[PDB]
């Protein structure tokens, strides 16, 4: 029947876990500052404030996922296209993930087999969002201890559209799961997915954004080697 109810109840729990960790930081750092102004040098004070700011932006990401989820059940998610240099936009996304990247000892790359600029008629906000989700998963699922971890964006044109690839040194994705990771709420609940923040909404939102552009998304992955996500979008006008 409709197991959707049980999947939404686990959704509630995941929301509560994703809210718990930033809130722990925000509460402890804010009350420490409040009780320690005489013991904080300026450098430590700004550092603690930045934790609050960074943790509150994790919560803003959670907020926007719940709103986008509302826009899926309502089938209301829309896009607004405009003439956009896609090279400057992927470069815009690697700067918004580079700090959170090196937080996990991971660099981000952007090769491009095609001359810049690459003009496409797309919704720059949502495509940037798609890029950030794939980049976020690249570092959120990088190999635990191993070094030189990276996530790479390769921009290219193929089959009468633009082909974006997001490749990483990840834990990998099993083949029994490669065909359902794009579904709402679904998450690989393996061993090495312990304290990993997770809604299971990201790739579903990504998929709907990509298809609204008239494109498709798919993945190729081998456990241990990493993952490659392919986004193909028509160029339009």
């Amino acid at each position: 029947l409709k197991r959707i109810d049980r999947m939404k109840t686990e959704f509630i729990a995941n929301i509560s876990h994703e809210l718990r960790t930033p809130l722990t930081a925000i509460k402890a750092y804010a009350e420490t500052i409040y009780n320690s102004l005489g013991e904080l040098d300026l450098s430590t004070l700004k550092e603690f404030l930045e934790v609050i700011i960074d943790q509150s932006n994790h919560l803003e990401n959670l907020l926007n996922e719940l709103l986008d989820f509302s826009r899926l059940e309502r089938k209301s998610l829309q896009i607004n296209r405009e003439k956009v240099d896609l090279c400057d936009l992927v470069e815009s996304a690697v700067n918004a993930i580079k700090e959170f990247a090196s937080s996990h000892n991971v660099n981000v790359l952007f090769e491009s087999n095609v001359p810049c600029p690459v003009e496409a008629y797309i919704d720059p906000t949502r495509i940037r969002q798609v890029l950030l989700n794939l980049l976020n998963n690249g570092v959120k699922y990088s190999k635990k201890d191993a070094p030189d971890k990276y996530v790479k964006v390769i921009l290219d044109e193929k089959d009468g559209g633009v082909l974006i690839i997001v490749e990483d040194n990840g834990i990998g994705i099993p083949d029994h799961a490669k065909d359902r990771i794009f579904e709402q709420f679904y998450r690989v609940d393996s061993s090495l997915t312990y304290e990993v923040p997770g809604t299971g909404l990201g790739l579903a939102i990504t998929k709907e954004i990509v298809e609204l552009h008239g494109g498709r998304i798919w993945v190729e992955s081998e456990v241990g080697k990493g993952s490659r996500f392919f986004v193909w979008i028509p160029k339009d006008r």
Binding site: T24, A25, A28, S36, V51, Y194, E195
Partner: protein, 121 residues
């Protein structure tokens, strides 16, 4: 002659704020990124107090707790468990493994320090 505390949690954001409030009181702090790395450090020294997370890679806090109840010189060390595990069974299991106090996160840094002082006086 300042007391030492071994701080064991997988999160750097958390270790930093707890370490800061511990040194306001003058304690030395030794950090461990997981439970196996923790125990490797109890071979080099013995602390006055352990602050322990539950959910960690490699070795979780529950198995750390019991290995401390095992070894003779670890037996008598106080352990505050500070964890996001909010279950009544999680606390009872942690308590039955020798933890003297379990505190949930989000936590109050000052309530946390009051319990730290209480277990060291």
């Amino acid at each position: 002659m300042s007391k030492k505390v071994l701080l064991v949690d997988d999160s750097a954001v958390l270790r930093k704020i707890v370490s800061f409030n511990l040194k306001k009181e003058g304690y030395e702090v030794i950090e461990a990124e997981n439970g196996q790395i923790a125990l490797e450090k109890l071979s080099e020294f013995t602390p006055d107090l352990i602050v322990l997370d539950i959910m960690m890679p490699v070795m979780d806090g529950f198995t750390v707790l019991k290995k401390l109840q095992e070894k003779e010189e670890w037996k008598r060390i106080p352990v505050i468990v500070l964890t996001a595990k909010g279950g009544e069974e999680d606390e009872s299991l942690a308590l039955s493994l020798g933890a003297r106090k379990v505190m949930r996160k989000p936590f109050s840094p000052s309530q946390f320090i009051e319990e730290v002082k209480h277990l060291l006086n």
